[PDB]
Amino acid sequence: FVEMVDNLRGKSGQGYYVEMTVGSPPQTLNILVDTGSSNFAVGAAPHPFLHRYYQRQLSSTYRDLRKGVYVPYTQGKWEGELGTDLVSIPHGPNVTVRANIAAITESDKFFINGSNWEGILGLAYAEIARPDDSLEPFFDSLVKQTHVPNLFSLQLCGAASVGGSMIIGGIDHSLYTGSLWYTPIRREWYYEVIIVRVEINGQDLKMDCKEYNYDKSIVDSGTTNLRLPKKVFEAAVKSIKAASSTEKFPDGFWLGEQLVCWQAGTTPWNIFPVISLYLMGEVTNQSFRITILPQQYLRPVEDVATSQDDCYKFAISQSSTGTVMGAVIMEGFYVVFDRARKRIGFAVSACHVHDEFRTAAVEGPFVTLDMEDCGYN
Ligand SMILES: Nc1ncccc1NCc1ccccc1
Numbered sequence: 001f002v003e004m005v006d007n008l009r010g011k012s013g014q015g016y017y018v019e020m021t022v023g024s025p026p027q028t029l030n031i032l033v034d035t036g037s038s039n040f041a042v043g044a045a046p047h048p049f050l051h052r053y054y055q056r057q058l059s060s061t062y063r064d065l066r067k068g069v070y071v072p073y074t075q076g077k078w079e080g081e082l083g084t085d086l087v088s089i090p091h092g093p094n095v096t097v098r099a100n101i102a103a104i105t106e107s108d109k110f111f112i113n114g115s116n117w118e119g120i121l122g123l124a125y126a127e128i129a130r131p132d133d134s135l136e137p138f139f140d141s142l143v144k145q146t147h148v149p150n151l152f153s154l155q156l157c158g159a160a161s162v163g164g165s166m167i168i169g170g171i172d173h174s175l176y177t178g179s180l181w182y183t184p185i186r187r188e189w190y191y192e193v194i195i196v197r198v199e200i201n202g203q204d205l206k207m208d209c210k211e212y213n214y215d216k217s218i219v220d221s222g223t224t225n226l227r228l229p230k231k232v233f234e235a236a237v238k239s240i241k242a243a244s245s246t247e248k249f250p251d252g253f254w255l256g257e258q259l260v261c262w263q264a265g266t267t268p269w270n271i272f273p274v275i276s277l278y279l280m281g282e283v284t285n286q287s288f289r290i291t292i293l294p295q296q297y298l299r300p301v302e303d304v305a306t307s308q309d310d311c312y313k314f315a316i317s318q319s320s321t322g323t324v325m326g327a328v329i330m331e332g333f334y335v336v337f338d339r340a341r342k343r344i345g346f347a348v349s350a351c352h353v354h355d356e357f358r359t360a361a362v363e364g365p366f367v368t369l370d371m372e373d374c375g376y377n
Contacts, residue, residue, distance in 0.1 A: 001172045007091035008033065008156070008164035009116075012302045013224055015327075016156055016164050017117040021088040022101060023059025028052070028090075030117040033154070033166055035191050035337065036220035036324075038129040039071070040087070040138040041080055042119030044103030049113045054103055061086045061098075069102050071130050076109035078102075087138065092168045093148050099141040123152065123221075123337070127189035139339070142168070150340040154221060156330045157351040160302060164351075176334035176347035181288040181362050183279040185342045186375060190218040193344055195323060196287050196371045197278035198232070200239040207235055209374035212277075216322030216376070219335065219344060223326030225256075225317045226275075226297060233318040236275075240316075243273035253314055259301055261311040269294060269355060275316075277329075280371045281364060282343070287371065288364030290346050292332045295353045296360070299328070332360035 009030075010016040017030040022042060029042055029052055043053040056062045065082040080102035088096045104110070104119070111118075126133040126140060136144070143150045148169040155175045156164040165175060186192040195212040198205045214229045228236055237254050246268070252258035262268070272294035278287045298312040315328045332352050336345035346362050354360065 001167050001170055004091055004167045005165045005172060005175070006163060008166055010162040010164070011115065012158065012160055012162060012299065014112050014115045015117070016162065016221060018092070018121065018166055019090050020121070021090060022054055023056070023085045024061040025058075026088060027054060027058065029054065029119050031119045031121045032117045032222070033123065034120050034220075034222035035123045035154070036218060036222040037120065037122035038124045038126060038137045039069070039102055039120065039122040039135070040099055041069075041071075041078060041102035041104050041122075043111065044080065045105050047107065047111055049111045049115070050118050051116055052118050054101070054119070056083065056085075056103060059085055065100070067131070069130050073109070076107075078104050078107035078110045080104040080106075082135070089168065092166070093146070095142070095146045095148060097142050097145045099138045100135050124190050125188040151336065151338045153334060153336040154330065155334050155349055155351060156221065156327060157349070158327070158331050158353070171336055175350050177350055178348050178362065180334075180336060180345035180347040181364050182282050182338065182343040182345040183288075184282065185344060188342065190216065190220075191337065191344060192216055192218055194280040194371065194374045195277050196280050196368045196374050197289070198236065199276040199278075199289075200236060201243050201273035203239065205232070205235050205239065207232065210376060212323060213374050214322065214376050217325070218322060219325045219330070221327070221330060223324050224299070224328065225315050225324065225326050226328040227317050227319040227321075227324035227326065229319055229322060232323070233316070236316065240273055240275075244271055246271040256314055256317045259304065259311040259313055261307065261309040264310055267298075267310060267312075270357065272298070274358060278366060278368060279346070280374070285367055285369055285371070286364070287366045287368040288346075288362065289366065290329070290333060291361045291363070292329060293354065293358050293360060295355070296328050296332050333362065
């Protein structure tokens, strides 16, 4: 696993990518690591933002599945032609596998101008694979065809240019301190989990925990933000707003309509609360909490063309897809996707950005009653 440590790169806000090779001879692409989706889809046409792209005509081991896929978002979309070919991961295990590939032939708001990736690796489960669960995701293909164990772990750092590690098939104990705690994967579609309690600085939100997982809580390397549903966002904001009242800021900033700024060497960390999410634990009435800092939900806007100060976006934001534990959360922690045991483990990350006062923590056990009532149906 030394071989896999530090095999992820990226740029702030533009996600984390791993090098992969597709086809024979191998074509190298940088692929986005995305636990919020289940499709393996690379650019197959010379879109002008793309550094590289898949040239099926150059690969002897390509096979057309003679079907299409249309995949919309808001209001991004991509569209492609299904096939299969031999995929490999240079800084992953030493294997080559035949996985499904969507040759992306048309997209909107999908590719990022500036980014250095050309495709997406959906690592979540078949139930949400487009066009349907017949299309076996890459990781299912990898485990099904090799002795690679049914688990992967992610250490997302971010110091600009970000870095991380995706350990395919195991856990690198150097990447985290203290102990892993595990929350059950509630269903194998997205990596769904159940938040049972939310505190800000310590004081909980006393809010029907069901609203925390309405209609989903997921773990999503594809998203930058911590995204909370409507009311929860409201409630958290108000409490973060209160907690933080040493100063005042515009209403827009909280809604991610504005940025807020201080000068170099002049941000007040402490004037901001910590956030704790308690997650359903492995045993009945047993939970554990993950605690982030504001260095995780105030992320600098790398380069703001009309400003030479220190600004930051409020990286907590609202939703109707559900809760979304994105970069904000995952950068605090080493996150083990133990697919083999339907569970996600969290440990304080050896590379997260702490100061000398506070630190990100994973702690337990706590006693939380009625944890199954927080899930929605
Ligand atoms: N996982 C995920 N979350 C939110 C929106 C999209 C998404 N997957 C597709 C995606 C495309 C481009 C960049 C990031 C994610």
